[PDB]
Amino acid sequence: MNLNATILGQAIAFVLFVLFCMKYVWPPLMAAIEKRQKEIADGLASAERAHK
Amino acid sequence: MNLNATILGQAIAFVLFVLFCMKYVWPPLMAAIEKRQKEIADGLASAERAHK
Amino acid sequence: NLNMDLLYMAAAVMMGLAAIGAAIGIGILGGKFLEGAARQPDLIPLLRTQFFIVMGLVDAIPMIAVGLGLYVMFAVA
Amino acid sequence: NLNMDLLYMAAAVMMGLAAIGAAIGIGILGGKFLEGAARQPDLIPLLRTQFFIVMGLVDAIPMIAVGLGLYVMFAVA
Amino acid sequence: NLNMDLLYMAAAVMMGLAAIGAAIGIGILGGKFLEGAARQPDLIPLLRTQFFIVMGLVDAIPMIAVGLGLYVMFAVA
Amino acid sequence: NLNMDLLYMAAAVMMGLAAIGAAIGIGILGGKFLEGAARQPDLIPLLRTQFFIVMGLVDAIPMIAVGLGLYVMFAVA
Amino acid sequence: NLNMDLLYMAAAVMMGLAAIGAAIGIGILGGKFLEGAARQPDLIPLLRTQFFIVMGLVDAIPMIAVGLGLYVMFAVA
Amino acid sequence: NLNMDLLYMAAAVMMGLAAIGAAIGIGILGGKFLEGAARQPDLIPLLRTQFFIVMGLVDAIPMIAVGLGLYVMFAVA
Amino acid sequence: NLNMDLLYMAAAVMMGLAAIGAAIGIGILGGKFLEGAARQPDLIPLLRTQFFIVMGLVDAIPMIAVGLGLYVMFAV
Amino acid sequence: NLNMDLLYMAAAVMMGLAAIGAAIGIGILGGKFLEGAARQPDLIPLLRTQFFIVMGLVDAIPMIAVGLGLYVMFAVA
Amino acid sequence: NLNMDLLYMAAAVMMGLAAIGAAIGIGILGGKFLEGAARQPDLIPLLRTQFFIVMGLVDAIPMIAVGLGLYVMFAVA
Amino acid sequence: NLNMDLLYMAAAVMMGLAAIGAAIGIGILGGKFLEGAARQPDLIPLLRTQFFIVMGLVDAIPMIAVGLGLYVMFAVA
Amino acid sequence: TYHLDVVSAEQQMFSGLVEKIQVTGSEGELGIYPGHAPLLTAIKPGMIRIVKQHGHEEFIYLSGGILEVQPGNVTVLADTAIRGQDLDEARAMEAKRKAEEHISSSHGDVDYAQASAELAKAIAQLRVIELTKK
Amino acid sequence: ENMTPQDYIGHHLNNLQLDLRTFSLVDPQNPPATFWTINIDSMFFSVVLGLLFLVLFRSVAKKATSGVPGKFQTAIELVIGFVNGSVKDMYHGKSKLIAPLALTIFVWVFLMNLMDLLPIDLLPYIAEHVLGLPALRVVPSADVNVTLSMALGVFILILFYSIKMKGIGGFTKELTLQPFNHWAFIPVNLILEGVSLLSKPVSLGLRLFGNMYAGELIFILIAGLLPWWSQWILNVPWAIFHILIITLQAFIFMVLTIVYLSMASE
C-alpha cells in the first residue's frame, strides 16, 4: 500500500520495548521460575537424605 | 444501506461469537491455568512432605 | 476503460496461481505430517514443530505473489 | 459493455483456480487422516484435532482468493 | 455478443474447475477409505463417518463455485 | 449473427473438463477397490457396495456439468 | 464463416480432454489390476471380472464427450 | 488465406492432448507390468498377455482423436 | 502475413505436448525398470527387452505429433 | 500508452509460475524429510542440514523469476 | 513486423514445454536410481550405466523440440 | 511499439515454465536423497555425490530456457 | 547357482543347490533367482516349488514361516512344513471338509479368526496337492 | 447517509494519515501525495498494545513469587514457559537478546492481530462521530509498514549475529562459496545466497500482512454486502476460523525469527 515513514517510527518503538523487556522484564521472571524449580529439586534431595 | 442496521447484525454475530468462546474456548485456558496451580502445588507440597 | 480492467485481470492470474501453490504444497506436506502422527502419536509435539518450520518456507513464495496481487488491485487500481 | 463483462471472467479464473487448489490439498490431507484412523482407531479424536489445525493452514490462501473473487463480481462489477 | 457469451464462458470456467477439484479430491480421499475398509473390515461404519466429516470440507469450497456458476448463467445471463 | 459458435465452445470446455474429473476420480477410487479385492477377496461384495456409496459423490459435480453442457448445445444453441 | 470454422476447434477440445480423462483413469485403474494379478495369480479371473465392472464407469462420461465431439464435427460441422 | 489458418490449430489441440493421454496412460499401465515381472519373472509372459489386452482399452479413445486430427489436417485442410 | 506466425505457433503446441507426453511416460516406465533392475540384476537383459517392447507403444503417439509438427512447420 | 498494461501481465505469469514450482518443490522435498524425522527423530538436526542444503537448489531458478518479475513490475513499468 | 514477435513467442513455449518434460522425466528416473543405489552401493557402477542407457531415450524428443526452438529463434527469427 | 509487449511475455512464459520443471524435478530427486540419508546415514557423502551427478542432468534443459529468456529480455527487447 | 536350506523344529525339510524356486510371501507368491533381491519376509500359508538341476521340481508344503534370501546360502524357516508325498491329495480334500464344517460351526469373530486359519491351512494343502501332480 | 456498499468498502480501506508539512487529518475523498504522512491509527494502537503488554508483565514480574502462583501470575508464567521452551528447543548460544525478543514478538503480534476480531464499525464509528477524525482502521498488523518495520528489525539482527558470531571472513565464505563450492561458480552464488538472505525478512513481513489485511477485508465485505439479518451466518464461521489464524501467525513470526537468528550464528 502507501510507502510510508511509519516503518521508521515503529522501528524506534520496537527497539525500545526489546531493551526494556531484555533488562527489566525477562531477568526477574526467569529468576522467579528457576528459583522455584530449585526448591522442588531440593525437596527431592531432602527425601533421599531422610531415608539415608 | 443504513449503517445502524449493519451494527445490529454485527451485534448478533458478536453475541454468537462470545458464546462459542464461552461454550468451548473458555475451558482449555482456565483448565490449563488451574492444572498449572495443581502442578505447582503438588510440586511444592511434595517438597514440604519431604521436609516432614 | 481497458487499462484499469486488465489490472484486475493480472491480479486474478497472480492470486489464483498462488492459491494453487499454497494449497497443494501444504496438502502434500500436511499429509506426511499426519502419517507420522499416526505412526508415533506420542511424538506429535516434536513433528508439529518441524511442520511449522517447513510449512513456513512453502508459503513464503506464494505469499509475496498474493501480496503483489492485492497491491495491483488496491494500490495500482 | 466489455469492461465489467470481462471482470466476471477475471473472478471465474481466480475463484476456480482456488477451488482446484483447496479441494485437492484437503483431499490429500484428509486421505492421510483416514489411513491414520485405520492404523490407530483408538486415536481418531487426537488425529482429527491435528487435521483441523493444518486444514486451517491449507484454506487460508484459497479463502481470501474466493473472497476477492466475490468482491470482484459484486463490489467491482 | 460480448455481454451474454462471456458470461456463459465464465460459468464454464467456474463449473469446470469445480468439476476437476470436487472429483479428484474425493477420489484421493475415497481410495484411503476403501483401503482402510479392506484392512479393518469391522471398522467400516467408523471410517465412513470419518469419511463424511472429511468429505464435507472438500466439497464445501467447490459448492460455492457450482452454485455461483448457476447464478451467473441464470440470474446474470 | 456469429454468436452461436461460442456456445458450442463453452459446452466443449464444460463437458470435456467434467470428463477429466469423472474419469480420473473413478480411476483412483476404483483401483484402490481392486487392490482391496486382490488382497482381501472375502470382502468383495462389501467393498463393491462401499465403492458405490463413495463413487456416487465423485461424479455428482461432473454430472451437473455434463447436464448443463447438453443444455447449452441442444437447448440454447 | 466462423460458424463453420470454430466448430472444429470446439470439437478438438472435447476429444482432447476426453482422451486425457479416459487414458489416465484406465492407466491408474489398470495398473492396480496388474500388481494384484502378479501378487495373486490364482485370482486373475476374479480381478479381471471386477476390473471390467469398474472400467465401464470410468468410460461413462468420456463417451458422452467423444460422441458429442463426433456429432459437433460431422452433424453440425 | 483467412479460412485454413485455424484448422491447423484444431488439429494441434487434438493431437497434443491425445499424445499426453496415450503416453502417460501407457506409462502408468506399463510400469505396473514391469513391477509384477520383477516379483514373478515366470509371469512376465502371463502379465504380458494382460498388458496387450488392457493397453487396447487405454489407447482406444486417443486414436479416435489422432484419427480425426489427421482427417481435419489432411481432408478438410 | 498473419498466416505464417500462427503455423509456427501451432507446431509449437503439438511438438511441446509431445515432449511432455514422451518424457513423463518414460520416466514412469523407466523408473519401474530401474527398481526392477536393482531387484533382479541378473534379469536386467530380460527386463530390458520388455522395456523396449512397451517403449515402442509409449513413443507411438508422440512421434505422430512430432511428424506433423515438422510438417506444419516446414512442409506447408 | 498501452505498454505499461502488458508488463504487469508479464510480471504476473513469472511470479505465478514461480510460486507453483517453489511451493510444490519444497512440499515434495519437505514431506520426505518429515517421514525421515518420523523414522529417526534423534537425526533431525542432521536431516535439517541436508534439507537446507538441498532446499537452496529448488529455490535457485524461482528466486530469479520472482527477482526479475518484481523488477519488471517496478523498474521497467 | 508482428511475425517475429510471435516467432520468439513460439520458440519460448516450445523450449519451455521441452524444459518441463525433459527435467521432470530425468528427475523421476534418477530418483529410482538413487533409491536402488541407497539399497546397495555395489550396484552404483551397474545402475549408473542403465541410467544413461535409459536417459538417452528420455532426451530423444525434447532435443528435437530444443533443436527446432533454436532454429525458429536464430534462423526464422 | 508492439515489439516489447509480446517479447517480455515470451520470456515470461519461457522462464515461468522453466521455474516449474527445475523446481519439481529437484524436489522429486531431492526427497529421494533425503529418505536415503535418513535410511542410510554413513553414506550421505556418497549419495550426495550421486545427487549432484543427477542434478546436473535435471538442470540441463531448464538452464537453456533461462539463458534464452535472459537473452530475449535484455538483448532482443 | 545358489544353495537353499529349509528347516523346521521337527526336521530339515530340504538342503542343497537349486536353480530356481517359487515361494509364498507376505503380499503374494514370489520368484527367486541367483543373485535375487536380498530380502527377508514373513510367508502366508502356501508352498514352495524346488526346481533343481536338470529341471526337476519338487513341492513342499509351507503352512507357516519366515524366509531369508540375502546370502548365496538362502533359508526358509518353517513353523510347520510337510513333504509333498507325506501329505496326499485325499488328505487335503479331507482338510476341505474340516474347514467347511468349522465355517458352518463358527459364528463369532474370535472363533472366525481360528476357523479362517483352519481354512487357510486346508486351502494351501489343496493347492500343493494339485501342484504335486506335475 | 448515502453510503453505497462500494463506497463503504472504500472509506474503510483508507487509513488516517498526517503530513510532516501540514499536520492535517486527511480524509478518503482526496489523498495527498508525499512520503511523510504518518498513519496515525497504526502508531497509536501499536504502542497502546505494546504498552499494555509491558504494563501487564511488569505488574507481575515486580511481584512474582516462587511459591504457588496466583491465578493471574500463572497465566503469565505459562507464556514465559512456552516462549522459553521454544527458544531452548532451537537456540543454544548464550545470548540474552533472543529470549526477550521472542517474547515481545509473540505477545505483541498476537495483541495486534486480536484487534481484527472486534466489530468492524465499533472503533471507526466512535472516532468519526464522537471525536471527528476523518477515517479509521484498527488492526495494526493489517498494514504493510509495521510488518516490514519488524521484519527489517529482524534483518539487522541477522546481519549482526552473522557478522559477530563468525566474522567477515566466515560470512564472506558462506556468501560466495556455497551452494556450488568451486570458485568458478562464485559469480552466481552471490545472487542465490544474496536473494536467499533478502527473501528471509521479505517473507516475514508479507506472510503476516497478507493474512491480516485480507482477513479484515472479509469483515469489511460481509458488513458491506450482506443484509444485517444474514451477516451472522457468514461472519460467525469466519471469526472462529480467524482465532486460529491470529494465533498461528503470531507463533510463526516468533518461530521463524528464532530459527533465523539461531541458524545465523551456529
Numbering used by the authors:
A (entry chain X), B (entry chain Y): 1 to 52
C (entry chain Q), D (entry chain I), E (entry chain P), F (entry chain O), G (entry chain N), H (entry chain S), ...: 3 to 79
I (entry chain R): 3 to 78
M (entry chain H): 3 to 136
N (entry chain a): 4 to 269
From the manuscript:
A key component in the generation of cellular energy is the F1Fo ATP synthase, a biological rotary motor that converts proton motive force (pmf) to adenosine tri-phosphate (ATP) in both oxidative phosphorylation and photophosphorylation. The enzyme is based on two rotary motors, termed F1 and Fo, that are coupled together by two stalks: a central rotor stalk and a peripheral stator stalk. The central stalk is comprised of subunits ε and γ and rotates during the enzyme’s catalytic cycle. E. coli and other related bacteria exploit an internal subunit, termed ε, that can sense the environment and inhibit the enzyme under certain conditions.
Here we present cryo-EM data showing E. coli F1Fo ATP synthase in different rotational and inhibited sub-states, observed following incubation with 10 mM MgATP. The sub-states of State 2 showed the best detail for the two εCTD conformations and allowed the c subunits to be assigned to Fo rotational sub-states based on their interaction with the εNTD, assuming that the c-ring remains bound during rotation, which is likely because the interface between the ring and central rotor has a buried surface of ~1200 Å230.
